[PDB]
Amino acid sequence: AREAIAQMKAAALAGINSRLFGLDGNISTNSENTERHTA
Amino acid sequence: AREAIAQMKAAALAGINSRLFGLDGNISTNSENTERHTA
């Protein structure tokens, strides 16, 4: 049975790419403006 | 789910330009006259 177990564990895991990062929360698509308006 | 949440938050915010200023109240299109009239 020691063989058959390892065959199961290996058969049920393939293609799963770990990729320890998820996604970052910090977005900056465009920097902050910091300018004014007048008439 | 930790991935899917961040995808939502990033998908629902794009193009919004912060622009921390609104508009100024002080207008001066033409300076104050301070002159008189007579006959």
mmCIF file of N, CA, C and O in Angstrom:
data_model
loop_
_atom_site.group_PDB
_atom_site.id
_atom_site.type_symbol
_atom_site.label_atom_id
_atom_site.label_comp_id
_atom_site.label_asym_id
_atom_site.label_seq_id
_atom_site.Cartn_x
_atom_site.Cartn_y
_atom_site.Cartn_z
ATOM 1 N N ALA A 1 0.817 -1.205 0.000
ATOM 2 C CA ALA A 1 0.000 0.000 0.000
ATOM 3 C C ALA A 1 0.852 1.257 0.000
ATOM 4 O O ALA A 1 0.392 2.319 -0.434
ATOM 5 N N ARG A 2 2.090 1.155 0.480
ATOM 6 C CA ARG A 2 2.978 2.307 0.512
ATOM 7 C C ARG A 2 3.240 2.848 -0.885
ATOM 8 O O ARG A 2 3.500 4.044 -1.047
ATOM 9 N N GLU A 3 3.183 1.987 -1.900
ATOM 10 C CA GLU A 3 3.317 2.451 -3.273
ATOM 11 C C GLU A 3 2.042 3.132 -3.751
ATOM 12 O O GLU A 3 2.090 4.216 -4.345
ATOM 13 N N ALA A 4 0.892 2.507 -3.496
ATOM 14 C CA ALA A 4 -0.359 2.993 -4.059
ATOM 15 C C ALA A 4 -0.720 4.371 -3.530
ATOM 16 O O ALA A 4 -1.294 5.190 -4.258
ATOM 17 N N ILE A 5 -0.403 4.646 -2.266
ATOM 18 C CA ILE A 5 -0.702 5.955 -1.695
ATOM 19 C C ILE A 5 0.034 7.038 -2.466
ATOM 20 O O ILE A 5 -0.551 8.048 -2.871
ATOM 21 N N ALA A 6 1.333 6.841 -2.679
ATOM 22 C CA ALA A 6 2.132 7.860 -3.338
ATOM 23 C C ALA A 6 1.671 8.079 -4.770
ATOM 24 O O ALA A 6 1.760 9.196 -5.294
ATOM 25 N N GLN A 7 1.161 7.032 -5.417
ATOM 26 C CA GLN A 7 0.615 7.206 -6.755
ATOM 27 C C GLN A 7 -0.613 8.104 -6.726
ATOM 28 O O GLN A 7 -0.813 8.923 -7.629
ATOM 29 N N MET A 8 -1.443 7.971 -5.692
ATOM 30 C CA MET A 8 -2.614 8.832 -5.577
ATOM 31 C C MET A 8 -2.198 10.281 -5.392
ATOM 32 O O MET A 8 -2.670 11.174 -6.104
ATOM 33 N N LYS A 9 -1.303 10.527 -4.435
ATOM 34 C CA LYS A 9 -0.897 11.888 -4.115
ATOM 35 C C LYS A 9 -0.271 12.576 -5.316
ATOM 36 O O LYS A 9 -0.440 13.787 -5.496
ATOM 37 N N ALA A 10 0.433 11.823 -6.155
ATOM 38 C CA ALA A 10 1.056 12.408 -7.331
ATOM 39 C C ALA A 10 0.070 12.551 -8.476
ATOM 40 O O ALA A 10 0.208 13.464 -9.298
ATOM 41 N N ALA A 11 -0.922 11.669 -8.546
ATOM 42 C CA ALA A 11 -1.886 11.742 -9.634
ATOM 43 C C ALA A 11 -2.840 12.908 -9.450
ATOM 44 O O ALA A 11 -3.310 13.486 -10.435
ATOM 45 N N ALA A 12 -3.130 13.265 -8.208
ATOM 46 C CA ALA A 12 -4.101 14.299 -7.905
ATOM 47 C C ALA A 12 -3.490 15.684 -7.799
ATOM 48 O O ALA A 12 -4.176 16.610 -7.361
ATOM 49 N N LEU A 13 -2.229 15.852 -8.185
ATOM 50 C CA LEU A 13 -1.573 17.153 -8.159
ATOM 51 C C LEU A 13 -0.717 17.286 -9.405
ATOM 52 O O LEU A 13 0.337 16.652 -9.515
ATOM 53 N N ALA A 14 -1.170 18.115 -10.335
ATOM 54 C CA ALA A 14 -0.429 18.375 -11.555
ATOM 55 C C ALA A 14 -1.016 19.610 -12.206
ATOM 56 O O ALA A 14 -2.239 19.752 -12.287
ATOM 57 N N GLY A 15 -0.141 20.504 -12.653
ATOM 58 C CA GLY A 15 -0.547 21.767 -13.212
ATOM 59 C C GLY A 15 -0.731 22.876 -12.198
ATOM 60 O O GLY A 15 -0.712 24.052 -12.580
ATOM 61 N N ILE A 16 -0.913 22.541 -10.924
ATOM 62 C CA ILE A 16 -1.060 23.556 -9.888
ATOM 63 C C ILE A 16 0.267 24.297 -9.778
ATOM 64 O O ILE A 16 1.274 23.730 -9.345
ATOM 65 N N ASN A 17 0.262 25.572 -10.155
ATOM 66 C CA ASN A 17 1.432 26.433 -10.069
ATOM 67 C C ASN A 17 1.314 27.255 -8.791
ATOM 68 O O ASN A 17 0.340 27.992 -8.614
ATOM 69 N N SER A 18 2.300 27.116 -7.905
ATOM 70 C CA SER A 18 2.194 27.650 -6.553
ATOM 71 C C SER A 18 2.041 29.164 -6.548
ATOM 72 O O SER A 18 0.986 29.672 -6.157
ATOM 73 N N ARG A 19 3.064 29.891 -6.999
ATOM 74 C CA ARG A 19 2.979 31.341 -7.173
ATOM 75 C C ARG A 19 2.638 32.036 -5.851
ATOM 76 O O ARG A 19 1.532 32.538 -5.648
ATOM 77 N N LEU A 20 3.619 32.020 -4.943
ATOM 78 C CA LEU A 20 3.377 32.390 -3.550
ATOM 79 C C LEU A 20 2.782 33.780 -3.379
ATOM 80 O O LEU A 20 2.194 34.055 -2.327
ATOM 81 N N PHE A 21 2.926 34.660 -4.361
ATOM 82 C CA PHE A 21 2.274 35.958 -4.321
ATOM 83 C C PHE A 21 0.873 35.873 -4.904
ATOM 84 O O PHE A 21 0.599 35.078 -5.806
ATOM 85 N N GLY A 22 -0.006 36.723 -4.388
ATOM 86 C CA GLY A 22 -1.363 36.836 -4.872
ATOM 87 C C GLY A 22 -1.497 38.032 -5.783
ATOM 88 O O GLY A 22 -1.160 37.958 -6.969
ATOM 89 N N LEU A 23 -2.003 39.135 -5.244
ATOM 90 C CA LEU A 23 -1.938 40.414 -5.926
ATOM 91 C C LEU A 23 -1.657 41.516 -4.918
ATOM 92 O O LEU A 23 -2.072 41.447 -3.759
ATOM 93 N N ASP A 24 -0.948 42.536 -5.382
ATOM 94 C CA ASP A 24 -0.645 43.704 -4.576
ATOM 95 C C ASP A 24 -1.847 44.632 -4.520
ATOM 96 O O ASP A 24 -2.612 44.741 -5.480
ATOM 97 N N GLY A 25 -2.006 45.308 -3.382
ATOM 98 C CA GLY A 25 -3.091 46.259 -3.240
ATOM 99 C C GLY A 25 -2.754 47.634 -3.769
ATOM 100 O O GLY A 25 -3.644 48.354 -4.229
ATOM 101 N N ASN A 26 -1.481 48.015 -3.726
ATOM 102 C CA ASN A 26 -1.079 49.345 -4.167
ATOM 103 C C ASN A 26 -1.201 49.436 -5.676
ATOM 104 O O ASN A 26 -0.490 48.743 -6.412
ATOM 105 N N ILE A 27 -2.096 50.300 -6.126
ATOM 106 C CA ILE A 27 -2.232 50.666 -7.529
ATOM 107 C C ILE A 27 -1.736 52.089 -7.692
ATOM 108 O O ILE A 27 -1.906 52.922 -6.794
ATOM 109 N N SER A 28 -1.078 52.355 -8.816
ATOM 110 C CA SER A 28 -0.834 53.725 -9.265
ATOM 111 C C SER A 28 -0.894 53.689 -10.787
ATOM 112 O O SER A 28 0.126 53.499 -11.457
ATOM 113 N N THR A 29 -2.096 53.877 -11.325
ATOM 114 C CA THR A 29 -2.249 54.009 -12.768
ATOM 115 C C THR A 29 -1.863 55.402 -13.239
ATOM 116 O O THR A 29 -1.415 55.567 -14.378
ATOM 117 N N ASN A 30 -2.027 56.404 -12.379
ATOM 118 C CA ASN A 30 -1.663 57.775 -12.697
ATOM 119 C C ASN A 30 -1.352 58.490 -11.394
ATOM 120 O O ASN A 30 -2.128 58.404 -10.438
ATOM 121 N N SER A 31 -0.216 59.182 -11.358
ATOM 122 C CA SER A 31 0.223 59.849 -10.143
ATOM 123 C C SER A 31 -0.776 60.923 -9.721
ATOM 124 O O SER A 31 -1.626 61.369 -10.493
ATOM 125 N N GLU A 32 -0.656 61.337 -8.465
ATOM 126 C CA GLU A 32 -1.563 62.324 -7.901
ATOM 127 C C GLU A 32 -1.258 63.708 -8.465
ATOM 128 O O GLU A 32 -0.096 64.087 -8.635
ATOM 129 N N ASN A 33 -2.319 64.464 -8.759
ATOM 130 C CA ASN A 33 -2.178 65.683 -9.552
ATOM 131 C C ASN A 33 -1.581 66.824 -8.735
ATOM 132 O O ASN A 33 -0.490 67.321 -9.042
ATOM 133 N N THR A 34 -2.281 67.255 -7.686
ATOM 134 C CA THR A 34 -1.860 68.373 -6.837
ATOM 135 C C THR A 34 -1.698 69.657 -7.651
ATOM 136 O O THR A 34 -0.610 70.228 -7.755
ATOM 137 N N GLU A 35 -2.805 70.106 -8.234
ATOM 138 C CA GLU A 35 -2.866 71.405 -8.887
ATOM 139 C C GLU A 35 -4.248 72.005 -8.676
ATOM 140 O O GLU A 35 -5.170 71.341 -8.196
ATOM 141 N N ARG A 36 -4.389 73.270 -9.060
ATOM 142 C CA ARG A 36 -5.531 74.101 -8.694
ATOM 143 C C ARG A 36 -6.376 74.447 -9.919
ATOM 144 O O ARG A 36 -6.113 74.007 -11.041
ATOM 145 N N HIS A 37 -7.405 75.255 -9.674
ATOM 146 C CA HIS A 37 -8.230 75.839 -10.721
ATOM 147 C C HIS A 37 -8.684 77.217 -10.270
ATOM 148 O O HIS A 37 -8.946 77.432 -9.084
ATOM 149 N N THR A 38 -8.778 78.142 -11.220
ATOM 150 C CA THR A 38 -9.353 79.456 -10.986
ATOM 151 C C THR A 38 -10.243 79.805 -12.169
ATOM 152 O O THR A 38 -10.364 79.040 -13.131
ATOM 153 N N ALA A 39 -10.871 80.970 -12.093
ATOM 154 C CA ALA A 39 -11.720 81.451 -13.168
ATOM 155 C C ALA A 39 -10.879 81.989 -14.319
ATOM 156 O O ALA A 39 -11.248 81.864 -15.485
ATOM 157 N N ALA B 1 -10.283 33.211 -1.882
ATOM 158 C CA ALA B 1 -11.093 34.418 -1.961
ATOM 159 C C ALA B 1 -10.250 35.673 -1.811
ATOM 160 O O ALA B 1 -10.650 36.747 -2.275
ATOM 161 N N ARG B 2 -9.088 35.554 -1.174
ATOM 162 C CA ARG B 2 -8.212 36.704 -0.993
ATOM 163 C C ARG B 2 -7.767 37.280 -2.327
ATOM 164 O O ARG B 2 -7.488 38.480 -2.421
ATOM 165 N N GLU B 3 -7.686 36.447 -3.363
ATOM 166 C CA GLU B 3 -7.372 36.947 -4.694
ATOM 167 C C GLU B 3 -8.572 37.644 -5.319
ATOM 168 O O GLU B 3 -8.446 38.743 -5.872
ATOM 169 N N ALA B 4 -9.744 37.015 -5.237
ATOM 170 C CA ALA B 4 -10.910 37.518 -5.950
ATOM 171 C C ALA B 4 -11.339 38.883 -5.437
ATOM 172 O O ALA B 4 -11.812 39.722 -6.213
ATOM 173 N N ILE B 5 -11.193 39.123 -4.134
ATOM 174 C CA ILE B 5 -11.569 40.417 -3.575
ATOM 175 C C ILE B 5 -10.737 41.519 -4.209
ATOM 176 O O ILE B 5 -11.264 42.540 -4.663
ATOM 177 N N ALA B 6 -9.421 41.323 -4.252
ATOM 178 C CA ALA B 6 -8.544 42.358 -4.772
ATOM 179 C C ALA B 6 -8.809 42.616 -6.246
ATOM 180 O O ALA B 6 -8.652 43.746 -6.724
ATOM 181 N N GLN B 7 -9.227 41.587 -6.984
ATOM 182 C CA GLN B 7 -9.588 41.800 -8.378
ATOM 183 C C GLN B 7 -10.810 42.699 -8.489
ATOM 184 O O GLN B 7 -10.888 43.543 -9.388
ATOM 185 N N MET B 8 -11.772 42.541 -7.580
ATOM 186 C CA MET B 8 -12.948 43.401 -7.600
ATOM 187 C C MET B 8 -12.562 44.843 -7.322
ATOM 188 O O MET B 8 -12.936 45.756 -8.066
ATOM 189 N N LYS B 9 -11.803 45.061 -6.248
ATOM 190 C CA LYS B 9 -11.444 46.413 -5.841
ATOM 191 C C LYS B 9 -10.665 47.132 -6.928
ATOM 192 O O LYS B 9 -10.810 48.346 -7.096
ATOM 193 N N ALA B 10 -9.854 46.398 -7.684
ATOM 194 C CA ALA B 10 -9.080 47.014 -8.751
ATOM 195 C C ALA B 10 -9.904 47.190 -10.014
ATOM 196 O O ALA B 10 -9.659 48.123 -10.785
ATOM 197 N N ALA B 11 -10.877 46.312 -10.239
ATOM 198 C CA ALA B 11 -11.687 46.415 -11.444
ATOM 199 C C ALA B 11 -12.659 47.578 -11.358
ATOM 200 O O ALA B 11 -12.994 48.182 -12.381
ATOM 201 N N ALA B 12 -13.112 47.902 -10.156
ATOM 202 C CA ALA B 12 -14.116 48.930 -9.959
ATOM 203 C C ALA B 12 -13.527 50.310 -9.735
ATOM 204 O O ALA B 12 -14.266 51.226 -9.368
ATOM 205 N N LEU B 13 -12.225 50.487 -9.944
ATOM 206 C CA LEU B 13 -11.580 51.785 -9.798
ATOM 207 C C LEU B 13 -10.565 51.949 -10.912
ATOM 208 O O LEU B 13 -9.506 51.315 -10.899
ATOM 209 N N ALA B 14 -10.890 52.803 -11.873
ATOM 210 C CA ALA B 14 -9.994 53.094 -12.974
ATOM 211 C C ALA B 14 -10.490 54.347 -13.666
ATOM 212 O O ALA B 14 -11.691 54.494 -13.906
ATOM 213 N N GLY B 15 -9.564 55.251 -13.969
ATOM 214 C CA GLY B 15 -9.894 56.529 -14.542
ATOM 215 C C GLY B 15 -10.213 57.611 -13.533
ATOM 216 O O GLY B 15 -10.145 58.796 -13.878
ATOM 217 N N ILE B 16 -10.562 57.242 -12.304
ATOM 218 C CA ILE B 16 -10.848 58.231 -11.270
ATOM 219 C C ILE B 16 -9.548 58.966 -10.963
ATOM 220 O O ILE B 16 -8.608 58.383 -10.415
ATOM 221 N N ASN B 17 -9.505 60.249 -11.304
ATOM 222 C CA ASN B 17 -8.359 61.104 -11.040
ATOM 223 C C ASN B 17 -8.646 61.892 -9.769
ATOM 224 O O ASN B 17 -9.636 62.627 -9.702
ATOM 225 N N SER B 18 -7.787 61.727 -8.762
ATOM 226 C CA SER B 18 -8.073 62.226 -7.423
ATOM 227 C C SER B 18 -8.228 63.740 -7.398
ATOM 228 O O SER B 18 -9.325 64.240 -7.137
ATOM 229 N N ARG B 19 -7.154 64.476 -7.688
ATOM 230 C CA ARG B 19 -7.217 65.930 -7.834
ATOM 231 C C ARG B 19 -7.733 66.590 -6.551
ATOM 232 O O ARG B 19 -8.855 67.090 -6.484
ATOM 233 N N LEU B 20 -6.881 66.548 -5.520
ATOM 234 C CA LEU B 20 -7.307 66.881 -4.162
ATOM 235 C C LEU B 20 -7.921 68.269 -4.036
ATOM 236 O O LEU B 20 -8.644 68.518 -3.065
ATOM 237 N N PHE B 21 -7.648 69.175 -4.967
ATOM 238 C CA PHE B 21 -8.301 70.472 -4.979
ATOM 239 C C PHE B 21 -9.612 70.407 -5.746
ATOM 240 O O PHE B 21 -9.762 69.636 -6.698
ATOM 241 N N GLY B 22 -10.554 71.245 -5.330
ATOM 242 C CA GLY B 22 -11.834 71.374 -5.987
ATOM 243 C C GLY B 22 -11.845 72.593 -6.877
ATOM 244 O O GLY B 22 -11.354 72.550 -8.008
ATOM 245 N N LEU B 23 -12.420 73.683 -6.381
ATOM 246 C CA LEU B 23 -12.266 74.980 -7.014
ATOM 247 C C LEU B 23 -12.123 76.053 -5.948
ATOM 248 O O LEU B 23 -12.690 75.955 -4.857
ATOM 249 N N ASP B 24 -11.360 77.085 -6.286
ATOM 250 C CA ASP B 24 -11.169 78.229 -5.416
ATOM 251 C C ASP B 24 -12.369 79.159 -5.496
ATOM 252 O O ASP B 24 -12.998 79.295 -6.546
ATOM 253 N N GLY B 25 -12.679 79.805 -4.373
ATOM 254 C CA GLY B 25 -13.774 80.754 -4.352
ATOM 255 C C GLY B 25 -13.371 82.141 -4.794
ATOM 256 O O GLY B 25 -14.192 82.876 -5.350
ATOM 257 N N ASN B 26 -12.116 82.519 -4.571
ATOM 258 C CA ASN B 26 -11.659 83.860 -4.918
ATOM 259 C C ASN B 26 -11.578 83.990 -6.428
ATOM 260 O O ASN B 26 -10.775 83.315 -7.080
ATOM 261 N N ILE B 27 -12.407 84.867 -6.971
ATOM 262 C CA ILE B 27 -12.355 85.271 -8.368
ATOM 263 C C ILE B 27 -11.843 86.697 -8.425
ATOM 264 O O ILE B 27 -12.132 87.507 -7.536
ATOM 265 N N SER B 28 -11.041 86.991 -9.444
ATOM 266 C CA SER B 28 -10.740 88.371 -9.820
ATOM 267 C C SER B 28 -10.596 88.376 -11.337
ATOM 268 O O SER B 28 -9.495 88.202 -11.869
ATOM 269 N N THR B 29 -11.714 88.582 -12.025
ATOM 270 C CA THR B 29 -11.675 88.752 -13.471
ATOM 271 C C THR B 29 -11.232 90.156 -13.849
ATOM 272 O O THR B 29 -10.635 90.351 -14.915
ATOM 273 N N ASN B 30 -11.509 91.135 -12.994
ATOM 274 C CA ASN B 30 -11.108 92.514 -13.222
ATOM 275 C C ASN B 30 -10.974 93.193 -11.871
ATOM 276 O O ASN B 30 -11.871 93.083 -11.030
ATOM 277 N N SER B 31 -9.854 93.881 -11.665
ATOM 278 C CA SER B 31 -9.582 94.514 -10.386
ATOM 279 C C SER B 31 -10.629 95.579 -10.071
ATOM 280 O O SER B 31 -11.370 96.047 -10.940
ATOM 281 N N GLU B 32 -10.679 95.959 -8.799
ATOM 282 C CA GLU B 32 -11.654 96.933 -8.337
ATOM 283 C C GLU B 32 -11.279 98.330 -8.818
ATOM 284 O O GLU B 32 -10.105 98.711 -8.821
ATOM 285 N N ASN B 33 -12.291 99.098 -9.230
ATOM 286 C CA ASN B 33 -12.047 100.336 -9.966
ATOM 287 C C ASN B 33 -11.566 101.455 -9.045
ATOM 288 O O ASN B 33 -10.445 101.957 -9.190
ATOM 289 N N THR B 34 -12.401 101.858 -8.088
ATOM 290 C CA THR B 34 -12.099 102.952 -7.161
ATOM 291 C C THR B 34 -11.830 104.257 -7.911
ATOM 292 O O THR B 34 -10.738 104.827 -7.854
ATOM 293 N N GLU B 35 -12.850 104.724 -8.625
ATOM 294 C CA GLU B 35 -12.824 106.041 -9.245
ATOM 295 C C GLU B 35 -14.222 106.638 -9.206
ATOM 296 O O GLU B 35 -15.201 105.963 -8.871
ATOM 297 N N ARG B 36 -14.313 107.913 -9.572
ATOM 298 C CA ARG B 36 -15.494 108.735 -9.341
ATOM 299 C C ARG B 36 -16.167 109.118 -10.655
ATOM 300 O O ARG B 36 -15.756 108.707 -11.744
ATOM 301 N N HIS B 37 -17.221 109.922 -10.529
ATOM 302 C CA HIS B 37 -17.899 110.535 -11.661
ATOM 303 C C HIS B 37 -18.410 111.902 -11.237
ATOM 304 O O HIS B 37 -18.830 112.085 -10.092
ATOM 305 N N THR B 38 -18.379 112.851 -12.169
ATOM 306 C CA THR B 38 -18.981 114.160 -11.977
ATOM 307 C C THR B 38 -19.706 114.543 -13.258
ATOM 308 O O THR B 38 -19.696 113.804 -14.249
ATOM 309 N N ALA B 39 -20.340 115.706 -13.236
ATOM 310 C CA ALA B 39 -21.038 116.218 -14.401
ATOM 311 C C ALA B 39 -20.051 116.783 -15.415
ATOM 312 O O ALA B 39 -20.261 116.691 -16.624
#
